[PDB]
Write a protein that binds this ligand. Structure first.
Ligand SMILES: Nc1ncnc2c1ncn2[C@@H]1O[C@H](COP(=O)(O)OP(=O)(O)O)[C@@H](O)[C@H]1O
Ligand SMILES: [Mg+2]
Lengths: 406, 80
């Protein structure tokens, strides 16, 4: 599963229609001057896929249209065309066309050109393994600092949410509301089988009288009905069996629960080092638990560690970056979006990241923007954004030209 | 694809659930492939599966109810 192609019209600075040349399944890098339409491009995609954009007050909605020179822009859309060649989306097509269109009143998703609900699209994406319990499918500079400058307490609340705790408590509670709605059906079932059993009893007796001496249909059909009641019985037994083995699930989950939370914790930690030890070679870093109350960080760039607060500038950022990259290894996804993440670090580390993406992009798709040439090494396709008479244009360029706009 | 993937779709997207899909499904042998899994699973994905199972369970119930109603009103139908 990857983003095969993006198409934008009327969204923020892309006034005219923009058919962005189809992405590489590896790393596509987007360059252009400041205020040319980079972040605006990631927004167009976040517009179609991110949870934070699903719910839009109309003021927020209108924010997304294009206010500029010409005739008053009146609707936008962004159609994302996925490649589904690995049937990861539950849709029997090799391509899937997700598109959201937008207007003063309208805010409408289309799936292979057919209307769907926001709640559909949420379910569809969740199903492909895009969890709304995971804020790091898109990574902006915003979320790097929010991570770096974060209390060890809030860093706990994060992992608990990622690990499960929230989605678990949310489904666990969601499930029970079903089962109690089911009981009313199950009893309404069991009742019927008793009522039916009496009419079979009744027929039995009428069919004995006449043999020993109330329509003929029922008598005629008495065999079939009898056969039919034992058909339904065996289905009712399936439920009464099934009910039991759901309670046996619900308990095993409330018990493997804490094992599974800490199961997750340990794994991020393990990945945390592996990622950092790889970017800063010779360095070492680990995670740590406070009181459970919070989750902190201790890092050694050579073992003389220092607290998270007791760190530098482009050092807090890079550390927090690794933490994210580790969370990613511990719940990967088909593709990622990076809006200027290299900015906050010096070029020695800038390359160290770019180097890691080379490896990563053989197994996932990356769409990224930058100002610094380090990550141009890591790219496979090159896009130039160009502002021009208040509207943006995106175009495929060659890596030579890419070392231009840096 | 696989044994549990039928349950996955149940908790996110039951469009791909036929009547025969619901019928075919052995709930018991599925909570078993949940409780002893191939690789211990994140607390998140356990919670999802849990829902799927209960979804199928519910639909099985819904269908059976529908059928017992039809069958009963088929009977007093044939009393005259
Ligand atoms: N709703 C909008 N309609 C038209 N133009 C917009 C809209 N919002 C922002 N712009 C403008 O388009 C440019 C934004 O491009 P942007 O991607 O945010 O910057 P950068 O290219 O550095 O990533 C800015 O001139 C910005 O103010
Ligand atoms: Mg920007």
């Amino acid at each position: 599963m990857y983003i095969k192609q993006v198409i934008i019209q009327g969204f923020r600075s892309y006034r005219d229609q923009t058919i962005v040349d189809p992405f590489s399944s590896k790393h596509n890098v987007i360059v252009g001057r400041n205020g040319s339409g980079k972040s605006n491009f990631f927004y167009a995609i976040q517009f179609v896929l991110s949870d934070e954009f699903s719910h839009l007050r109309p003021e927020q909605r209108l924010a997304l249209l294009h206010e500029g020179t010409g005739p008053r822009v009146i609707s936008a859309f962004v159609e994302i065309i996925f490649d589904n060649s690995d049937n990861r989306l539950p849709i029997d097509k090799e391509e899937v066309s997700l598109r959201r269109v937008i207007g003063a009143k309208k805010d409408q998703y289309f799936l292979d050109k057919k209307m769907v609900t926001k709640n559909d699209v949420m379910n569809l994406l969740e199903s492909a393994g895009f969890s709304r319990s995971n804020p790091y499918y898109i990574v902006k500079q915003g979320k790097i600092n929010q991570m770096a400058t974060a209390p060890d307490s809030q860093r706990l609340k994060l992992l608990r949410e990622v690990a499960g705790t929230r989605v678990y408590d949310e489904r666990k509670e969601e499930s029970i509301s079903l089962m109690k709605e089911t009981e009313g059906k199950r009893e309404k079932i069991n009742e019927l089988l008793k009522y039916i059993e009496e009419r079979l009893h009744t027929l039995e007796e009428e069919k004995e009288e006449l043999a020993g001496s109330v329509n003929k249909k029922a008598l005629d059909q008495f065999v079939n009905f009898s056969e039919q009641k034992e058909k339904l019985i065996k289905r009712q037994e399936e439920l009464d069996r099934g009910y039991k083995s759901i309670m046996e699930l619900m308990n095993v989950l409330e018990l493997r629960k804490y094992e599974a939370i800490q199961l997750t914790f340990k794994q991020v930690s393990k990945n945390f080092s592996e990622v950092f030890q790889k970017l800063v070679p010779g360095g070492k870093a680990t995670l740590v638990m406070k009181k459970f109350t919070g989750v902190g960080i201790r890092v050694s760039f050579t073992g003389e560690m220092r607290e998270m607060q007791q760190l530098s500038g482009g050092q807090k950022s890079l550390v927090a970056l690794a933490l994210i990259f580790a969370i990613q290894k511990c719940d990967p996804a088909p593709f990622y979006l990076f809006d200027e993440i290299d900015q906050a670090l010096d070029a020695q580390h800038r390359k160290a990241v770019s180097d890691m993406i080379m490896e990563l992009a053989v197994h996932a798709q990356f769409i990224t923007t930058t100002f610094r040439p380090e990550l141009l090494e890591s790219a496979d396709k090159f896009y130039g954004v160009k502002f021009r008479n208040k509207v943006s244009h995106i175009d495929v360029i060659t890596a030579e030209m890419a070392k231009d706009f840096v | 694809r696989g044994p549990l993937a039928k349950i996955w779709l149940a908790a996110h997207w039951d469009k791909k659930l036929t009547k025969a899909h619901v019928f075919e499904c052995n709930l018991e042998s599925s909570v078993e492939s949940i409780i002893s899994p191939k690789v211990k699973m994140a607390l998140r994905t356990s919670g999802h599966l849990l829902l799927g199972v209960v979804r199928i369970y519910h639909r099985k119930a819904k269908y059976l109810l529908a059928d017992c109603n039809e069958a009963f009103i088929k009977i007093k139908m044939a009393f005259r």
